[PDB]
């Protein structure tokens, strides 16, 4: 009831012999589950929480230098010595200047000089880490039944929200009037948070790769430094200039926030302002529809007239939604909603709001359905005052088949081998495909780690040409396939 208006909506149809389905919930998407004699349900991964993160490293973006001091040694006499050179909060450099009689030395040549200035971090950015045990995904399950009575219900929200954690593998949600739904979620495999850091800069946070973050060329402190002054690679944030071999000065390099933003061009912005909330990534769950039953299946069809209070609106997925008010008596009753052909011989459209019912006369009901391509007629109610609303879909079965193939391909590109677990019932074909995809994805990630989309496209074009120019038709086909997949992935990558 909340995923009609979402562009990234997927319909998981059917269950297994055990009455379970495997669905992968992405943050920006929703899943509508439909099974025979089962209520339609909407599932949305609405939150990921990283709890009690531990600071791993601290990086300096804006620094300042103070207390600059210098010491000089006459040529051939060794190296100059500064007392501040023994303090690690002072950054130092040794260089050689021209020395002679004019500036007070006995002989002519290069004399050693050392410049030390105190290094202070004005602004820093922390990279934090969360253990997989401390993730708390939130999922909203809504019975996909059209009841716009938010005020009418005691709770106020028709959707029921369950918090998934690694501690318990089974989560049970009781949808009042529908039985209960069981979710076997896998927070462990959603995102590897052992290999990731939660990098928060000034008032903005990102989700970055751990090795990338530990290879950042900035002054850093360890996560437990606790004095805040012993920065490690301070030389990355200062410049030592000895332009004419006459004098040496040290200046600081300017705020590096803004260059950090350029560095973060492939990251996902997360939010740490009021808690470490992540709105990216997926969660693979197993949906057990064993104690899930329709609602009001013991009611009798309404013997009254329905008034349309909101005209049939097509959703972005080809399903039509319409709101109908009930005017007749016998308030609690089933809504005789059917999708027919012109002659009303065949019922050729399926209802997505299975078993629509009017709980109260005064309150309207939202009904969604998936009409067929072409002309179809929505008949609502019994014949005295019967509503017969026509509709045209404007698609083709071949067209939506191509669209579904593209949706599945994009899911494979985004989710990887996890795409084989979306709306999947345990089968030989799915398991074999997932194993093959695991092997291929491991090899591909090894071969294409760290390269950008333009590099991916160049490599794919090169591989395609190499394969097309090979005398063996087997190796040629293999290389062309690899190159075409690389080109697709490079085009689909980023964001």
């Amino acid at each position, epitope marked *: 009831m909340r995923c009609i208006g979402i562009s990234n909506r997927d319909f998981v149809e059917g269950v297994s012999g055990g009455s379970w389905v495997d669905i992968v919930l992405e943050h920006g998407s929703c899943v509508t589950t439909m099974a025979k004699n089962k209520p339609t349900l909407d599932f949305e991964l*609405i939150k990921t929480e990283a709890k009690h993160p531990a600071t791993l490293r601290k990086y300096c973006i804006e620094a300042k230098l103070t207390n600059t001091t210098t010491a000089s040694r006459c040529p051939t006499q060794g190296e100059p010595s500064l007392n501040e050179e023994q303090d690690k909060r002072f950054v130092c450099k040794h260089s050689m200047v021209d020395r002679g009689w004019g500036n007070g030395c006995g002989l002519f040549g290069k004399g050693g000089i050392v410049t030390c200035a105190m290094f202070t971090c004005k602004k820093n950015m922390e990279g934090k880490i969360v253990q997989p045990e401390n993730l708390e995904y939130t999922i*909203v399950i809504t019975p996909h039944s059209g009841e716009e009575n938010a*005020v009418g219900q005691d709770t106020g929200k028709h959707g029921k929200e369950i918090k998934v954690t690694p501690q318990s593998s089974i989560t049970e949600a009781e949808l009042t009037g529908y039985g209960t739904v069981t979710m076997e979620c896998s927070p462990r495999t959603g995102l590897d948070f052992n290999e990731m850091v939660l990098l928060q800069m000034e008032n903005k946070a990102w989700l970055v790769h751990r090795q990338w973050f530990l290879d950042l060329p900035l002054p850093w402190l360890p996560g437990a430094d606790t004095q805040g002054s012993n920065w490690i690679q301070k030389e990355t944030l200062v410049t030592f200039k000895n332009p004419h071999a006459k004098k040496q000065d040290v200046v600081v390099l300017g705020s590096q926030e803004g260059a950090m933003h350029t560095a973060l061009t492939g990251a996902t912005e997360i939010q740490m302002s009021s808690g470490n909330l992540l709105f990216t990534g997926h969660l693979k769950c197993r949906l057990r529809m064993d104690k899930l039953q329709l609602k009001g299946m013991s009611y009798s069809m309404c013997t009254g007239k329905f008034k349309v*209070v909101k005209e049939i609106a097509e959703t972005q997925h080809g399903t039509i939604v319409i709101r109908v008010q009930y005017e007749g008596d016998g308030s609690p009753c089933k809504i005789p909603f059917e999708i027919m052909d012109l002659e009303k011989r065949h019922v050729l459209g399926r209802l997505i709001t299975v078993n629509p019912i009017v709980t109260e006369k005064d309150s*309207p009901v939202n009904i969604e359905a998936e009409p067929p391509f072409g002309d179809s007629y929505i008949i609502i109610g019994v014949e005295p005052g019967q509503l017969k609303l026509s509709w045209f879909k404007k698609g083709s079965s071949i067209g939506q088949m191509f669209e579904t193939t593209m949706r599945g391909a994009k899911r494979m590109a985004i989710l990887g081998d996890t795409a084989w677990d979306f709306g999947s019932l345990g089968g030989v074909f799915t398991s074999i495909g997932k194993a093959l995809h695991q092997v291929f994805g491991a090899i591909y990630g090894a071969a294409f780690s760290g390269v950008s989309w333009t590099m991916k496209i160049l490599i794919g074009v090169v591989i395609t040409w190499i394969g097309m120019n090979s005398r063996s038709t087997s190796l040629s086909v293999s290389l062309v396939l690899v190159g075409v997949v690389t080109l697709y992935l490079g085009v689909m990558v980023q964001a």
Partner: antibody, heavy 126, light 111 residues
Framework: EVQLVESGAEVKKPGASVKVSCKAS????????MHWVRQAPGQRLEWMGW????????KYSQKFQDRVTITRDTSASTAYMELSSLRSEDTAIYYC?????????????????????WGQGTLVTV | SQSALTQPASVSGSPGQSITISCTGT?????????VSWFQQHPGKAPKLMLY???SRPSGVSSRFSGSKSGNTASLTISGLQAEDEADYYC??????????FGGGTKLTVL
């Protein structure tokens, strides 16, 4: 039971600034955006602004943008509306209506049932 | 502040009669979207939401109150007019800009 309670009516001189307080009870205050709608003794309702109690984001009407500040306290679950440089035409009853923010927390599109619950109202006389 | 939605100043109806209060706005607020909420307010009391989403009404509001929208105009029809329905009715809209524009209001007077 959801009830919103505002501080009692106050009387002030034209140059002063008044701070009305709306206290939300019976719901997750941080999960609802608190609106401030003004009325005058016989004139139409005037929307002023809303404060997102979840993250403190605010929005004001152009009419009141320059001289109104909407603040919320997470701890006591209260929403303040301080009207500075509050001249005589500002003699009004000040209500506080509530609308719910999205699951993501931010207030981008309101809920169709906005202003479902109002406070009793505070009368400010200048 | 946009511009206040305009509706008739007053409306009078005999008990048991059907009364329509029309609210007019631009394509930005009422013509554009469906955030047309009607608020009933008896004098000295906070406005009560009677209609939202143009036609939808809250749980405690009776089926007498029904609303509609046509182009840039929103209508509030009160069937079975009763003496207790003596209050100022304000139409409010969420505008395209992201602000709220209340209507001027009509006083519904019985007989």
């Amino acid at each position: 039971e959801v009830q919103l309670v505002e501080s009692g009516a106050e009387v002030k001189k034209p140059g002063a600034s008044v701070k009305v307080s709306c206290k939300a009870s019976g719901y997750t205050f941080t999960s609802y955006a608190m609106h401030w709608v003004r009325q005058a003794p016989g004139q139409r309702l005037e929307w002023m602004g809303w404060i997102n109690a979840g993250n403190g984001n605010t929005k004001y009407s152009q009419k009141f943008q320059d001289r109104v500040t909407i603040t919320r306290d997470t701890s006591a679950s209260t929403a303040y509306m301080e009207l500075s440089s509050l001249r005589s035409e500002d003699t009004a009853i000040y209500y506080c209506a509530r609308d719910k923010v999205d699951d993501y927390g931010d207030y981008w599109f309101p809920t169709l049932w906005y202003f479902d619950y109002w406070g009793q109202g505070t009368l400010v006389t200048v | 502040s946009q511009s206040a939605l305009t509706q008739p100043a007053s409306v009078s109806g005999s008990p048991g009669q059907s009364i329509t209060i029309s609210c007019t706005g631009t394509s930005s607020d009422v013509g554009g979207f469906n955030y047309v909420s009607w608020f009933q307010q008896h004098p000295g009391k906070a406005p009560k939401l009677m209609l939202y989403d143009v036609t939808s009404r809250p749980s405690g509001v009776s089926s007498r109150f029904s609303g509609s929208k046509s182009g840039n105009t929103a209508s509030l029809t009160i069937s079975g007019l009763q003496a207790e329905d003596e209050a100022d009715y304000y139409c409010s809209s969420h505008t395209s800009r992201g602000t709220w524009v209340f209507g001027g209001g009509t006083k519904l007077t019985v007989l």
